[PDB]
């Protein structure tokens, strides 16, 4: 059975391999050239420095996928809004590993006191698995930026979905998370 | 009132632009900043937009800058290279006079000329900032989403309203080379 745990620096090689394959063959990522392992490490060190959780799914000593949270935008009024990203190795897809990862990410983001979790889903018309995954964990549709991306010779839509946490906007906020 | 003219931003405009933005940050929820940036930070932001190649425009009458508008990236990853975002701020005593429309119309023309295919408006506190929504509707932007409770400012939860305008055919044809390449 797979376990969800925190990202550890030794994972960065596999995670680069997982993300590299997503960049090259998929449209969930709007990057075109795969980042280097060092660049991936710098990106993850910035997230952790901000205080955001970075999680990996591991079975039989191998990293099956990863998910992390970050800011949608950084201006201070946005400080109760987080964004999720999740990538699963192709040989591990369709096994329930995405939902396990995202379920735990929601719990961590919720405990940090965020009020909204945003999915910015690249090529949402085509990446049905991403939309279904988020619907299955209670995200609701909140917008669609048409023709926001062009990659592999076609236009891509960005599907936006959000999940309220800790009462959402119906209650007064607490202190800023990560403050 | 003398007709405002639209021209490219000049570095010496930054003092007035900072004054305009400061008043908006302090008294309004269109911006999700809380503490107003300094004039030197504003200068650095505008230099960076201009370095990327984005147009920055001001409306000027009787020697005074009455408002400004600029474009920038929504997000910087390469597949987004045909998507731009607009920002526009008008001085309080110049609002409701068509200056926002004059500036945004010319920004659309300049951004279209660069080969972008979509122009995105990310409107803070859309429930309250009707002027922002109406300005963008009046120039053909269509609603494309609403992030509820995206901001908290001035004691209130705020919704972000998203609107977009296709340019040069939008997503109906293959794009040209990346703008600003
Ligand atoms: C905001 C974001 O990060 S969006 C994701 C961006 N990342 C990518 O696009 C990278 C490539 N894709 C992936 O990494 C993965 O396939 C993901 C993230 C889309 C899903 O991860 P998975 O491990 O495959 O998901 P998991 O097995 O937990 O099931 C996901 C849910 O969506 C459904 N689903 C998963 N894959 C598919 C698919 N290809 N087609 C249709 N439905 C699918 C499942 O049925 C399940 O919901 P259910 O309760 O109705 O059964
Ligand atoms: C993505 C963005 O940048 S959103 C804007 C962010 N900026 C701010 O919030 C700062 C504070 N507000 C402002 O700077 C300005 O008021 C703006 C930019 C929202 C609008 O600019 P203005 O010059 O006031 O608008 P302008 O007079 O040009 O009117 C544009 C259109 O919107 C309409 N409109 C403007 N304000 C309102 C209002 N409060 N209620 C109803 N309609 C309005 C006008 O009737 C006009 O439409 P029409 O030509 O069909 O008659
Ligand atoms: Cl000058």
């Amino acid at each position: 059975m797979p376990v969800i745990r925190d990202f550890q620096p030794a994972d960065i090689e596999t995670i680069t391999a997982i993300y590299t394959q997503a960049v090259l063959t998929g449209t969930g990522s709007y990057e075109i050239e795969p980042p280097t392992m060092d660049e991936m490490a710098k990106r993850f060190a910035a997230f952790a420095d901000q205080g955001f959780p970075i999680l990996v799914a591991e079975a039989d000593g191998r990293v099956l996928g990863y998910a992390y949270a970050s800011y949608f935008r950084v201006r201070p009024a946005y400080r109760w809004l987080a964004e999720d990203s999740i990538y699963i190795a192709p040989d591990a897809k369709g096994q329930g590993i995405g939902k396990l990862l995202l379920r735990e990410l929601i719990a961590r983001i919720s405990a940090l006191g965020f009020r909204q979790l945003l999915a910015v889903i690249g090529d949402g018309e085509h990446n049905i698995g991403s939309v279904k995954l988020h619907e299955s964990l209670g995200f609701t549709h909140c917008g669609r930026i048409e023709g926001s991306g062009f990659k592999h010779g076609r236009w891509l839509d960005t599907v936006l979905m959000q999940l309220p946490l800790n009462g959402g906007r119906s209650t007064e906020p607490g202190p800023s998370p990560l403050s």
Side-chain angles (χ1 to χ4, degrees), chain A residues 2-32 34-41 43-61 63-90 92-171 173-178:
Chain A
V3 78
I4 310 285
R5 64 163 166 85
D6 291 24
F7 159 86
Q8 302 169 357
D11 301 320
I12 199 61
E13 165 181 319
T14 297
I15 294 180
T16 300
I18 293 171
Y19 187 63
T20 291
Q21 191 275 161
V23 173
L24 289 170
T25 81
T27 56
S29 171
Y30 282 21
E31 296 195 88
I32 307 293
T36 65
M37 189 179 309
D38 284 336
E39 164 67 14
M40 292 293 286
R43 291 178 186 188
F44 277 21
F47 297 144
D49 191 51
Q50 294 175 298
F52 286 106
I54 312 167
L55 314 173
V56 307
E58 167 184 72
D60 299 280
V63 176
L64 301 136
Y66 67 93
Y68 65 89
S70 56
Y71 286 122
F72 165 67
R73 296 191 151 181
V74 295
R75 294 331 187 189
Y78 286 117
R79 237 97 235 201
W80 293 266
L81 171 71
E83 169 176 359
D84 72 281
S85 311
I86 172 169
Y87 289 88
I88 305 298
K93 290 172 182 176
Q95 308 185 17
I97 289 161
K99 192 175 185 188
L100 235 67
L101 248 183
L102 182 56
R103 177 176 276 120
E104 177 63 21
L105 189 65
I106 294 166
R108 302 278 304 265
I109 277 284
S110 193
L112 295 168
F114 285 89
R115 294 306 187 85
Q116 303 290 341
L117 185 55
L118 184 69
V120 183
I121 303 178
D123 187 18
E125 175 89 336
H126 180 85
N127 294 324
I128 299 145
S130 314
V131 174
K132 301 295 208 178
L133 164 59
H134 285 82
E135 293 172 346
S136 77
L137 283 177
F139 286 70
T140 66
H141 287 279
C142 62
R144 170 167 194 142
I145 306 171
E146 300 187 77
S148 56
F150 190 83
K151 184 179 168 176
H152 291 342
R154 65 189 181 89
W155 290 104
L156 318 171
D157 298 343
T158 299
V159 169
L160 305 152
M161 303 188 74
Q162 70 180 124
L163 171 74
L165 306 166
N166 296 296
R169 55 157 295 151
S170 63
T171 68
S176 145
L178 313 182

